[PDB]
Each structure stands twice: as structure tokens, then as C-alpha cells.
Design an enzyme around this catalytic site. Sequence first.
Site, PDB file in Angstrom:
ATOM      1  N   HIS A 186       0.816  -1.221   0.000  1.00  0.00           N
ATOM      2  CA  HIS A 186       0.000   0.000   0.000  1.00  0.00           C
ATOM      3  C   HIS A 186       0.850   1.272   0.000  1.00  0.00           C
ATOM      4  O   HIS A 186       0.328   2.368  -0.239  1.00  0.00           O
ATOM      5  CB  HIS A 186      -1.072  -0.016   1.095  1.00  0.00           C
ATOM      6  CG  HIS A 186      -0.572   0.361   2.456  1.00  0.00           C
ATOM      7  ND1 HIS A 186      -0.226  -0.575   3.411  1.00  0.00           N
ATOM      8  CD2 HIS A 186      -0.405   1.576   3.036  1.00  0.00           C
ATOM      9  CE1 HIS A 186       0.144   0.048   4.519  1.00  0.00           C
ATOM     10  NE2 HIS A 186       0.047   1.353   4.317  1.00  0.00           N
ATOM     11  N   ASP A 192      -0.024  -7.626   1.730  1.00  0.00           N
ATOM     12  CA  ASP A 192       0.453  -6.231   1.749  1.00  0.00           C
ATOM     13  C   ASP A 192       1.982  -6.161   1.901  1.00  0.00           C
ATOM     14  O   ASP A 192       2.520  -5.840   2.969  1.00  0.00           O
ATOM     15  CB  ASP A 192      -0.269  -5.439   2.859  1.00  0.00           C
ATOM     16  CG  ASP A 192      -0.034  -3.941   2.773  1.00  0.00           C
ATOM     17  OD1 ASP A 192       0.454  -3.473   1.727  1.00  0.00           O
ATOM     18  OD2 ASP A 192      -0.362  -3.230   3.754  1.00  0.00           O
ATOM     19  N   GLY A 226       1.658   6.788   8.684  1.00  0.00           N
ATOM     20  CA  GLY A 226       3.048   7.230   8.530  1.00  0.00           C
ATOM     21  C   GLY A 226       4.056   6.172   8.959  1.00  0.00           C
ATOM     22  O   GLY A 226       5.223   6.250   8.578  1.00  0.00           O
ATOM     23  N   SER A 271       3.369   3.042   8.206  1.00  0.00           N
ATOM     24  CA  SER A 271       3.091   2.043   7.157  1.00  0.00           C
ATOM     25  C   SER A 271       4.348   1.576   6.472  1.00  0.00           C
ATOM     26  O   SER A 271       5.188   2.400   6.083  1.00  0.00           O
ATOM     27  CB  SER A 271       2.187   2.661   6.081  1.00  0.00           C
ATOM     28  OG  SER A 271       0.878   2.813   6.573  1.00  0.00           O
ATOM     29  N   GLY A 272       4.460   0.265   6.271  1.00  0.00           N
ATOM     30  CA  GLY A 272       5.594  -0.289   5.534  1.00  0.00           C
ATOM     31  C   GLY A 272       6.809  -0.605   6.388  1.00  0.00           C
ATOM     32  O   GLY A 272       7.725  -1.302   5.951  1.00  0.00           O
TER      33      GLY A 272
HETATM   34  N1  H06 Z   1      -3.501   0.951  14.168  1.00  0.00           N
HETATM   35  C1  H06 Z   1      -2.465   0.703  13.361  1.00  0.00           C
HETATM   36  N2  H06 Z   1      -1.546  -0.078  13.755  1.00  0.00           N
HETATM   37  C2  H06 Z   1      -2.414   1.361  12.012  1.00  0.00           C
HETATM   38  C3  H06 Z   1      -3.568   1.971  11.520  1.00  0.00           C
HETATM   39  C4  H06 Z   1      -3.551   2.594  10.273  1.00  0.00           C
HETATM   40  C5  H06 Z   1      -2.392   2.621   9.502  1.00  0.00           C
HETATM   41  C6  H06 Z   1      -2.420   3.312   8.177  1.00  0.00           C
HETATM   42  N3  H06 Z   1      -3.010   4.457   8.094  1.00  0.00           N
HETATM   43  N4  H06 Z   1      -3.085   5.159   6.956  1.00  0.00           N
HETATM   44  C7  H06 Z   1      -3.894   6.223   6.804  1.00  0.00           C
HETATM   45  O1  H06 Z   1      -4.648   6.608   7.697  1.00  0.00           O
HETATM   46  C8  H06 Z   1      -3.864   6.980   5.497  1.00  0.00           C
HETATM   47  C9  H06 Z   1      -2.689   7.047   4.748  1.00  0.00           C
HETATM   48  C10 H06 Z   1      -2.671   7.749   3.537  1.00  0.00           C
HETATM   49  C11 H06 Z   1      -3.840   8.381   3.103  1.00  0.00           C
HETATM   50  N5  H06 Z   1      -4.955   8.310   3.844  1.00  0.00           N
HETATM   51  C12 H06 Z   1      -5.000   7.637   5.014  1.00  0.00           C
HETATM   52  C13 H06 Z   1      -1.231   2.008   9.990  1.00  0.00           C
HETATM   53  C14 H06 Z   1      -1.244   1.376  11.242  1.00  0.00           C
END
Ligand code: H06
Length: 223
Positions: A40, A84, A175, A177-178
Site C-alpha cells: 500500500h 500487503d 506514517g 506504514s511499511g
Molecule cells: N492501528 C495501526 N496499527 C495502524 C492503523 C492505520 C495505519 C495506516 N493508516 N493510513 C492512513 O490513515 C492513510 C494514509 C494515507 C492516506 N490516507 C490515510 C497504519 C497502522
Amino acid sequence: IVGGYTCGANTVPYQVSLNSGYHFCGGSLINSQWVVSAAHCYKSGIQVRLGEDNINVVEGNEQFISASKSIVHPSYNSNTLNNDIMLIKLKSAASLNSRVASISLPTSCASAGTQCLISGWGNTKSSGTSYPDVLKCLKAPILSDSSCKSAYPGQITSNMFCAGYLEGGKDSCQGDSGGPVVCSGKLQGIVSWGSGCAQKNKPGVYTKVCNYVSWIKQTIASN
Ligand SMILES: N=C(N)c1ccc(/C=N/NC(=O)c2cccnc2)cc1
Ligand SMILES: [Ca+2]
């Protein structure tokens, strides 16, 4: 990372920042030429930033290397987030040292209860929004698959696991993510998704890296 701590500069030497004019995702260096991240996180024009602590200040240990190719998992589904995972090849090999180092891939899957280190430059607030400049860390246990499935009915596949705290307060977030989930010195997870961040009964969901080691190795072998 919500409810975590300041890692300390270059204490997480496999942690990378993916940059497209700004930090937008984490990743994990797995050898001198390859990074593992979330599918993603895919976009064109990625520069991989290694050796980062403060992502807004050049502090002296950075290596900035452009991606030459990205490979999203063949079976990635952007709606369910199943599979993912993505590989990114660097245009040139990173110079590996104490502060820029690869992380080992697992040879077996991790069990519920294992402690892991999750890290990133993502949001630090569960309600509002505050993005840190320096790398944040969270120690968290892998949760049982049954509790994971109960938290997220109809959404947890065999390629996902939950880690964190059902009570809330401590989690990865937007943020992050990844980025890496490292358990006993092995990359077992990738920051994938969750409902909000650090919410009660909504732990972080992570890509189950041990399922992909075969694909990672053969992909690297031919690319
Ligand atoms: N709870 C976690 N461990 C968790 C939850 C969410 C995420 C990812 N979020 N990404 C977003 O909101 C997003 C990102 C880009 C554009 N629009 C929304 C990661 C971990
Ligand atoms: Ca920096």
C-alpha cells in the site's frame, strides 16, 4: 507510533524512510540492494533514505539512494490488504556499517506472546495529529490469531497477524506504514493497517513476513 519512546539515533539500523519529496512510509533494509515495505506504500519516484534519525535534518549518517524498481506482491489486494508486501531495489548498493544494516528474514514464523520492536516516523497521537521528526519505537507482543480475528471479524487472513495491546494506548499509526516489526532479531511483520490508532480492542495488523520469504528470495535471485 503512539505511546512509544524515542528509539535513539541509528539504534534501528535497518529502518528506512521512503521519500517522495517528504517521508511517506517506512521500510526495512534486507540486504545491500533491497528494501521490504508494504504494497500500500507503492508509488513511483521513491528515494530510499537510510541511516535516518531526524528526517528533517541532515545529521551525518544518511545514505540517500533512488529506487531502480518496485515489485508489488503478485497477489496484493488493495481492498482487503491481503498480501500487503512490496520489494524495492536500490539503484546502488548501500554501504553497510553499524548504523546502516540489514535485518534477517525469518526461517520460521513467530508465535503469539513473542515481544517485537515496531518503529517509524508516523503519527504519535491517537486522537489528534503530531508527526515526530526523530524515530519512535514501541515494544509490543504478538497477539493470538483468535484474539486478532475477534477484534476484526471477517478481515484477518492467514497473511496477517495482530500485535500490540487490546487495552489501547500503544500502537503504530499513519506514517508508520511499511515499517518493521522485528522479533528476536528477525523481520516478522510489516506495518499494514488498523482501525484508527491505539484504540481499545483495535490492535495493529501486520503483514506476516514469514509467509513471503520464499517469494522474497526468488524475486531477489532474478532481479
Ligand atoms: N492501528 C495501526 N496499527 C495502524 C492503523 C492505520 C495505519 C495506516 N493508516 N493510513 C492512513 O490513515 C492513510 C494514509 C494515507 C492516506 N490516507 C490515510 C497504519 C497502522
Ligand atoms: Ca536526517
